Design an enzyme around this catalytic site. Structure first.
Site, short mmCIF file in Angstrom:
data_model
loop_
_atom_site.label_atom_id
_atom_site.label_comp_id
_atom_site.label_asym_id
_atom_site.label_seq_id
_atom_site.Cartn_x
_atom_site.Cartn_y
_atom_site.Cartn_z
N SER A 1 -4.90 -19.40 -4.15
CA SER A 1 -4.97 -20.76 -4.74
C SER A 1 -5.65 -21.69 -3.75
O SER A 1 -5.88 -22.86 -4.09
CB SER A 1 -3.69 -21.33 -5.29
OG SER A 1 -2.72 -21.55 -4.29
N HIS B 1 3.44 -6.48 6.95
CA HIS B 1 4.40 -5.88 6.00
C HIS B 1 5.57 -5.18 6.66
O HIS B 1 6.19 -4.38 5.93
CB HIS B 1 3.66 -4.85 5.08
CG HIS B 1 2.59 -5.65 4.39
ND1 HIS B 1 1.33 -5.23 4.12
CD2 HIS B 1 2.70 -6.94 3.94
CE1 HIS B 1 0.71 -6.23 3.48
NE2 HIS B 1 1.51 -7.28 3.36
N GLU C 1 -2.18 -0.70 5.83
CA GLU C 1 -1.86 0.31 4.82
C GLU C 1 -2.45 1.66 5.19
O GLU C 1 -3.59 1.87 5.63
CB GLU C 1 -2.49 0.00 3.46
CG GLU C 1 -2.53 -1.41 3.00
CD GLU C 1 -3.21 -1.88 1.77
OE1 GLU C 1 -3.96 -1.05 1.25
OE2 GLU C 1 -3.11 -2.94 1.13
N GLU D 1 3.75 -2.90 -3.09
CA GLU D 1 2.88 -1.92 -3.72
C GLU D 1 3.36 -0.49 -3.93
O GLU D 1 2.71 0.38 -4.53
CB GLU D 1 1.62 -1.88 -2.80
CG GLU D 1 0.83 -3.20 -2.93
CD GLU D 1 -0.48 -3.40 -2.22
OE1 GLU D 1 -1.00 -2.41 -1.65
OE2 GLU D 1 -0.99 -4.58 -2.24
N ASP E 1 -6.26 0.86 5.62
CA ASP E 1 -6.63 -0.51 5.30
C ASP E 1 -6.16 -1.17 6.62
O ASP E 1 -4.94 -1.29 6.73
CB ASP E 1 -6.08 -1.24 4.14
CG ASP E 1 -6.35 -2.75 4.08
OD1 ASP E 1 -7.18 -3.36 4.80
OD2 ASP E 1 -5.66 -3.28 3.22
N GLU F 1 -10.95 0.59 5.60
CA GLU F 1 -11.06 -0.72 4.98
C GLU F 1 -10.80 -1.81 5.99
O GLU F 1 -9.81 -1.70 6.75
CB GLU F 1 -10.14 -0.94 3.77
CG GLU F 1 -10.37 -2.19 2.92
CD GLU F 1 -9.26 -2.46 1.97
OE1 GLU F 1 -8.71 -1.48 1.41
OE2 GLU F 1 -8.92 -3.60 1.69
N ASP G 1 -13.54 -5.55 2.40
CA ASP G 1 -12.59 -6.21 1.45
C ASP G 1 -12.63 -7.73 1.80
O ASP G 1 -13.31 -8.45 1.05
CB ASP G 1 -11.24 -5.52 1.41
CG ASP G 1 -10.18 -6.43 0.81
OD1 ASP G 1 -10.52 -7.49 0.18
OD2 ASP G 1 -8.95 -6.15 0.96
N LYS H 1 -12.13 -6.87 -6.46
CA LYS H 1 -10.93 -7.55 -7.00
C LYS H 1 -11.49 -8.55 -8.01
O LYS H 1 -12.01 -9.59 -7.65
CB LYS H 1 -10.11 -8.20 -5.95
CG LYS H 1 -9.62 -7.23 -4.90
CD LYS H 1 -9.00 -8.01 -3.77
CE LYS H 1 -8.01 -7.08 -3.07
NZ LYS H 1 -7.61 -7.65 -1.73
N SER I 1 -9.62 -2.26 -7.17
CA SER I 1 -8.32 -2.52 -6.60
C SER I 1 -7.46 -3.50 -7.39
O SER I 1 -7.80 -4.39 -8.17
CB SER I 1 -8.73 -2.86 -5.19
OG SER I 1 -7.76 -3.46 -4.44
N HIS I 2 -6.17 -3.29 -7.22
CA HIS I 2 -5.00 -4.00 -7.69
C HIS I 2 -4.83 -5.15 -6.68
O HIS I 2 -5.48 -5.31 -5.67
CB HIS I 2 -3.76 -3.13 -7.51
CG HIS I 2 -3.37 -2.67 -6.14
ND1 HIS I 2 -2.07 -2.18 -5.94
CD2 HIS I 2 -3.92 -2.61 -4.92
CE1 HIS I 2 -1.89 -1.77 -4.70
NE2 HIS I 2 -2.99 -2.06 -4.07
N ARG I 3 -3.86 -5.98 -6.99
CA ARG I 3 -3.44 -7.14 -6.20
C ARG I 3 -1.96 -6.77 -5.88
O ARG I 3 -1.28 -5.90 -6.45
CB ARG I 3 -3.51 -8.52 -6.86
CG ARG I 3 -4.84 -9.02 -7.38
CD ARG I 3 -5.99 -8.77 -6.48
NE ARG I 3 -5.77 -9.47 -5.20
CZ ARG I 3 -6.31 -10.68 -4.91
NH1 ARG I 3 -7.18 -11.26 -5.77
NH2 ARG I 3 -5.94 -11.38 -3.84
N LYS J 1 -7.80 1.98 -6.02
CA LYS J 1 -6.68 1.67 -5.09
C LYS J 1 -5.73 0.86 -5.93
O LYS J 1 -5.95 -0.30 -6.31
CB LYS J 1 -7.25 0.91 -3.92
CG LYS J 1 -6.20 0.57 -2.83
CD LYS J 1 -6.91 -0.42 -1.88
CE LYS J 1 -5.92 -0.98 -0.91
NZ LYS J 1 -6.68 -1.93 -0.07
#
Lengths: 436, 436
Positions: free
Chosen positions: A39, A159, A168, A211, A246, A295, A320, A345, A372-374, A396
């Site tokens: 945002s 994470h 990742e 994830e 990643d 990545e 990315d 993305k 890729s996903h979010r 991914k």
């Protein structure tokens, strides 16, 4: 013809609000749910959040929903656009917004309408979505390519506890002969990894991250890598399964140097690494483990570390954060021989036309494309059809755990089954699945 | 008319195989995905797993899929059954199987077909699923009742380290006036709980368990309860949100006594409790915290502890493991005044007709009915429509995290929006939402 455009607020895999759009046409109601994006804007389409702290911790999308309902809907209906003409749909939307990062209307309001319309176009054309997507992107359709899934099994970085800086650790069943076979193998390694983790780190080590991977307190990349290789060995799939990394290196880049002990919080600056010393640590890992994709190995503006590294990498290097699905950023990246694969993305750019365009330019420069996903996914399986229509050969989309991840893997099971002999699994040709 | 019955293997929220059935009729293809159930039987429908250790850790459902494809499909098509006549569908299926626990064909093969047909019947009748379900169960339809969701926020027991014996801590926004409002409140408390957890227990404490709650290393029920009350206080929803407990007491019952330190593993038998001392510890908790529901407070065959307790409980007491959605087990339970609410797990019985029947008998005895998810859920939202058609007023479907959980909560958002003034939120009348 579009007779109605409607938006509502629904929740994403993290419990945060997101936008769901419904498009009505004489064939029925087509829906789309948007993954939670940014945002505050890099060189990326901006996602619009109410900022009202007294509601959803300031993450409503009530405005964004008003933009659909109050501005787009009215205008879009009256425009009488042919949903089949995707570019026209997107151009319509972008013209309505008038900014470069969809900050007027919000990338979340816009993308929801952009994706609902491709669903509506496929219905109308009476073809499966993936086939419509293949038509928009002018992909080969004979046969179609099923991707190697890059499954998140373990997380570090921002994470987890432990000193592990790389974000990742993914496994990639390149050795399977079918998507169904790769997904079964991938789940067994995963299940085996979970067992070992609970064993060596305790029961809390068994809990998953956003994830689906585990996030035990690991100290080093080698430690983490060793655990995955053991899990591969125990599932009995030694040699058939590779590793993808990643690094999210933007997170530990400070002072033109990389801090591998960034959770320090007494990290010895004597120990930070320059681009070239970092290149050296990755070379090491690469010789010891079956890594086939790295990545974001360097920070988003560290152009010279990318290039240097890229020279001797010899494996797939994915941009990315360096490219943020931005074609101006993609062109530099190409120009500079910084990497050779793009993490796409769709919501980083906000529109299906611009997403496809960004994949095509990549492909024209000989790059591969990883869909890729979010972090904040939904039950919407759109990326399953997109990776097949784009013919990329690699996606991914999370660990084989949490249905915001499995919804997409289940969908690829279904497409695979449906294509019969018209489908090939990219296998080892994942990098260039587009040229198969 | 049913022209085709097809089954495939897909994955559940835990990465384990499960059955997906597709039913074709002249209106289209109706699909259902089965939650992962039990394959070894209590007084419950048995789920059938290949047991082939060399595949999916011995959890394929390849046989179960063969049963659909090879036995049911052929027979079902030829039977020419009216999908509208659900009892006929179910009776058909049960007669095909011929055992009492669906061990011939597998409860997983059978339920998938049973649920796909109600989807097909609703299409045909041209009504939303929830309305078709209201017709089958002969529920009041004016207005419809939206349930209070019982959101899992924290787990202990067999789900975590720490000495905490009680299995699930749930929050219930009874004070909201709309389902949309209860779901927003519930997510804020949840988000607040996560923050506190990461704060007081560290970053690993932030990882979720199978259903979406956190599983930090907590020592006592009071500790856990205190943390949730703090989270309620911090989201600013003090008084609007209640707590629900799932003690899973079968797990720590040994020797006619209850071991609250069952992870001991040097647990002082001097410290185990009898039914009546346990009743005493729950009375204590009940006086100190806003608890409105206790699930499986005593072990599955400890009939006298249930009854005794039940006498002075004064809150909703849910039978889950005691009744296992089994009507013979339900009748005893009623007969004995052991509890006053049934946890309904459609796959514990294997058929939509028998699930509805079990809810109706409960309702006839003045019990409430809590519709529930399984540990291994899917992207299928069937339980969202069922809890609305059954008019129960309360559903237990996970934390507001992981889309196998949110898919169902998103679906209730949608139904709510669609009913306009024809819907009421059960609020504080959750216990008896059927009589509203």
């Amino acid at each position: 013809a579009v007779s109605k455009v409607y938006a509502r607020s629904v929740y994403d895999s993290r419990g945060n609000p997101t936008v769901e759009v419904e498009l009505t046409t004489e064939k029925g109601v087509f829906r789309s749910i948007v993954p939670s994006g940014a945002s505050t804007g890099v060189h990326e389409a901006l996602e619009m959040r109410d900022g009202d702290k007294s509601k959803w911790m300031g993450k409503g999308v009530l405005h964004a929903v008003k933009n659909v309902n109050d501005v787009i809907a009215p205008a879009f209906v009256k425009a009488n656009i042919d949903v089949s003409d995707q570019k026209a749909v997107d151009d319509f939307l972008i013209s309505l917004d008038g900014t470069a990062n969809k900050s007027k209307l919000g990338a979340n309001a816009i993308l929801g309408v952009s994706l609902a319309a491709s669903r509506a176009a496929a219905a109308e054309k009476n073809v499966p979505l993936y086939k419509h997507l293949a038509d928009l992107s002018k992909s080969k359709t004979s046969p179609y390519v099923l991707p190697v899934p890059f499954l998140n099994v373990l997380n570090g970085g921002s994470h987890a506890g432990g000193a592990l800086a790389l974000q990742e650790f993914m496994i990639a069943p390149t050795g399977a002969k079918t998507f169904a076979e790769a997904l079964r193998i991938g789940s067994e390694v995963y299940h085996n990894l979970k067992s070992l983790t609970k064993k060596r780190y305790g029961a809390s080590a068994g809990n998953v991250g956003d994830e689906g991977g585990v996030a035990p307190n690991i100290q080093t990349a080698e430690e983490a890598l060793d655990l995955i290789v053991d899990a591969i060995k125990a599932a009995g799939h030694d040699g058939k399964v590779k590793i993808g990394l990643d690094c999210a290196s933007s997170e530990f880049f400070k002072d033109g140097k990389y801090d591998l002990d960034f959770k320090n919080p007494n990290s010895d600056k004597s120990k930070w690494l320059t681009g070239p010393q970092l290149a050296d640590l990755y070379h090491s890992l690469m010789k010891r483990y079956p890594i086939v994709s790295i990545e974001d190995p360097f920070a988003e503006d560290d152009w010279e570390a990318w290039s240097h590294f890229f020279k001797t990498a010899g494996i797939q290097i994915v941009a990315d954060d360096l490219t943020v699905t931005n074609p101006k950023r993609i062109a530099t990246a190409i120009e500079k021989k910084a990497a050779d694969a793009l993490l796409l993305k769709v919501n980083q750019i906000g529109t299906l036309s611009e997403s496809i365009k960004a994949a095509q330019d990549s492909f024209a420069a000989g790059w591969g494309v990883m869909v890729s996903h979010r972090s904040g996914e939904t039950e919407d399986t759109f990326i399953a059809d997109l990776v097949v229509g784009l013919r990329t050969g690699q996606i991914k989309t999370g660990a084989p755990a949490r249905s915001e991840r499995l919804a997409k893997l289940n969908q690829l099971l279904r497409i695979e089954e449906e294509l019969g002999d018209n489908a090939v699994f990219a296998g080892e040709n994942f990098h260039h699945g587009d040229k198969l």
